[PDB]
């Protein structure tokens, strides 16, 4: 132990945590390679999503080289602290963290070569621009970008260690609403006013399941509708019947369009589950004014009044019915 | 890199953190140059909004010229904590905070001049007094306040570098119920009873979008007002009937009222 | 993937005006900015301005600062280019660009990943 004790006292004489590996000479090769833990949550409302990675990076300082050691060395983590390590970032994320219990989560394993193998595990929340037009029968594409904050590619290059299997763990993620149906790695070099700077991004594409609307949205407003239609089969003569009827069912559709909409963001343009309940609305409101018009009808038309009932009593529900048809078939 | 090494401790050798440049002379201009990544929430209810920022400095310190090197030096991230930086805050932000993963989200570039570059990514919530009263059909002006927080004229000036061009990022700004119309940069010194101090002012208005409203407030009270009208189509004998629609629709109009009146201030 | 055409372009005498569009299909979402880059014979590529998803940022160059405007209208899925008082100088072929997310500064041709191929602007003094 006492001679690789003073091998590592050697290899810090001397090292200055403020330069990079060839500092005037060419830019360092990182390596990136991320192992998924989960993503813990995805909100809509503010439009990011938390996730849990193993965030491992390559680099060579031939400043820590040792020949006589024929061995990887893995140190504690706090030698993180007297090194140089890459000045990685996270484009787009909120607020990051990296996990201190029981330790810091950071891992050093050195090797001989001279190579470092710096993993770190992180939990961000990243944001998600949500293109809710499709909701809840949309997709959204979420990303991570990676970049160096002060490097330019003049002294940094990033590239995915392992090209399309640099990331793994996209199969564990388990999220209640959302399924990951495919994911992508790219590697760009953005142009900012200070430089160029070299950037990394995954990407995942979240399919929504919508087992949670149909209990929560769908069926709802398919009942409230179809209440309101059982006031075609009373007697025109109920009129306060027909008229708690058109009332209730009127009252509970406006007050399903406000629930489903408070569980958004609020956005400016109108989902595919706002279309859906406004068209409830109007065969809703359709179902009272057709018992408005046929009590206003009563006397004055007799006839006519019973034939718009005994239409009704069909025209509504097969164009709800076709209308069903063609909405989910638009959307699927 | 031993000899950078070594051009870096004489420039470190005696360097004292505690003084400015020019401690006893003219004052520092210090440039700002700000990169809007996003404005992530604006709150009308505690009357702040959430933005998110590369905040870009700019100013010459002699102590930390060398002739010998013929390129621009990014130094890592740790030397802040042993160099002279302005003691820039924001006036009127209620928490803030620079990004910490992986490393402290800071840069530092130096030029053989002397001349500095410190930037910082950092996230503000910065207080937004609204004015309400055309809401939501308004508009609001939401500024954030650049100052030094101990130095006067007297030991710094501020200015926004590139004048106009000094903010980026507006463009990148997406938020669900505004849009932002236009933006203003301002420099200004105000006094204060301990001293006049130097003052940069980033403004952008924010004006919104209706869509939200009229599913949710407008077509509900719209719709509520014509189901009240409903009863004139009834006879006056259906007394039980006509006050259905009366009583329903009088109360479902508070209801709307006071929900409305929750997601505000 | 992104798809961008453009149209309006043709010969205008100087101090004229004209009206370029440029027409998207596709992921527009995914590259929220739009941006117009106009290239003459010699000269090397020129920004000329740029506008947000909202349409209500935008931004230009000093050149052609407050002589051109630049608006949006993402019902139909177009963004336009009025350009008044034209002068021979904006001679080029006018280019329609669309930006990722998160690709860096407007001003750089490199970040825009998709583009239109050009339309023609000749100002005959």
């Known amino acids: 132990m006492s001679f690789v004790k003073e091998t590592v006292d050697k290899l810090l004489k001397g090292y200055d945590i403020r330069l990079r590996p060839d500092f005037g000479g060419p830019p360092v090769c990182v390596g990136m390679n991320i192992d998924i833990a989960s993503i813990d949550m995805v909100s809509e409302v503010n439009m990011d999503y938390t996730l849990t990675m193993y965030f491992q990076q390559y680099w060579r300082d031939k400043r820590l080289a040792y020949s006589g050691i024929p061995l990887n060395l893995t140190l504690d983590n706090r030698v993180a602290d007297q090194l140089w390590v890459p000045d990685t970032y996270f484009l787009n994320d909120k607020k990051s963290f990296v996990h201190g219990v029981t330790v810091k989560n950071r891992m050093i394993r050195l090797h001989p070569d001279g190579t470092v193998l710096y993993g770190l595990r992180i939990t961000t929340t990243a944001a998600c621009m949500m293109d809710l037009r499709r909701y809840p029968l949309d997709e959204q594409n979420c990303t991570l970008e990676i970049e160096s904050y002060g490097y330019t590619t003049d002294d940094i290059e990033f590239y995915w260690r392992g090209g399309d299997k640099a990331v793994t763990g996209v199969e564990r993620i388990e999220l209640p609403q959302f399924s990951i149906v495919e994911h992508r790695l790219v590697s760009r070099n953005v142009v900012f006013a200070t430089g160029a700077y070299p950037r990394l991004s995954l990407s995942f594409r979240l399919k929504r399941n919508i087992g949670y609307f149909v209990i929560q949205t769908y069926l709802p407003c398919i009942m409230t509708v179809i209440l309101s239609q059982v006031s075609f089969w009373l007697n025109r003569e109920s009129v306060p019947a027909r008229t708690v009827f058109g009332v209730t069912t009127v009252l509970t559709m406006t007050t399903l369009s406000i629930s489903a909409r408070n569980s958004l963001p609020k956005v400016a343009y109108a989902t595919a589950m706002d279309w859906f309940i406004a068209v409830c609305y109007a065969f809703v409101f359709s179902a009272l004014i057709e018992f408005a018009t046929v009590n206003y009808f009563t006397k004055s038309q007799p006839a006519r009044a019973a034939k718009i009932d005994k239409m009704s009593r069909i025209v509504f529900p097969i164009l709800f019915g076709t209308f069903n048809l063609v909405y989910w078939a638009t959307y699927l | 890199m031993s000899f950078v090494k070594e051009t870096v401790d004489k420039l470190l050798k005696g360097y004292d953190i505690r003084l400015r440049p020019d401690f006893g002379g003219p004052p520092v201009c210090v440039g700002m140059n700000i990169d809007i990544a996003s404005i992530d929430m604006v709150s009308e209810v505690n009357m702040d909004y959430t933005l998110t920022m590369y905040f870009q400095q700019y100013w010459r310190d002699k102590r930390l010229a060398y002739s010998g090197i013929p390129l621009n030096l990014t130094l890592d991230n740790r030397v802040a904590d042993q160099l002279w930086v302005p003691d820039t805050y924001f006036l009127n932000d209620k928490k803030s905070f620079v990004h910490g993963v992986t490393v402290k989200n800071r840069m530092i570039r130096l030029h053989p001049d002397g001349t500095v570059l410190y930037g910082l990514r950092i996230t503000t919530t910065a207080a937004c007094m609204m004015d309400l009263r055309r809401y939501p059909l308004d508009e609001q002006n939401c500024t954030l306040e650049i100052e030094s927080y101990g130095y006067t004229t007297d030991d710094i000036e501020f200015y926004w570098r590139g004048g106009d061009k000094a903010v980026t990022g507006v463009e990148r700004i997406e938020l669900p119920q505004f849009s932002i119309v236009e933006h203003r940069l301002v420099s200004r010194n105000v006094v204060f009873a301990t001293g006049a101090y130097p003052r940069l002012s980033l403004s952008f208005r924010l004006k919104r979008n209706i869509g939200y409203f009229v599913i949710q407030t407008y077509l509900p009270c719209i719709m509520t007002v014509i189901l009240s009208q409903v009863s004139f189509w009834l006879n006056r004998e259906s007394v039980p009937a006509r006050t259905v629609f009366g009583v329903t629709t009088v109360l479902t109009m508070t209801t709307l009222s006071i929900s409305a009146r929750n997601s505000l201030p | 993937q992104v798809q961008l055409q453009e149209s309006g372009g043709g010969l205008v005498q100087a101090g004229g005006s004209l009206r370029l569009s440029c027409a998207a299909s596709?992921?527009?979402?995914?590259?929220?900015?739009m941006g117009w880059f106009r290239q003459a014979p010699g000269k090397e590529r020129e920004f000329v301005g740029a506008?947000?998803?909202?349409?209500?940022?935008?931004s230009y160059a000093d050149s052609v600062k407050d002589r051109f405007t630049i608006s949006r209208d993402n019902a139909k899925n177009t963004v336009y280019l009025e350009m008044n008082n034209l002068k021979p100088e904006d001679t080029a072929v006018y280019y329609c660009?669309?930006?990722?997310?998160?690709?860096?500064?407007?001003?750089?041709?490199?970040?825009?990943?998709?583009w239109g191929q050009g339309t023609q602007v000749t100002v005959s003094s």
């Open positions: 596709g992921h527009t979402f995914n590259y929220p900015i």
């Open positions: 660009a669309a930006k990722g997310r998160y690709s860096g500064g407007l001003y750089y041709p490199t970040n825009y990943d998709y």
């Open positions: 506008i947000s998803w909202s349409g209500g940022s935008t």
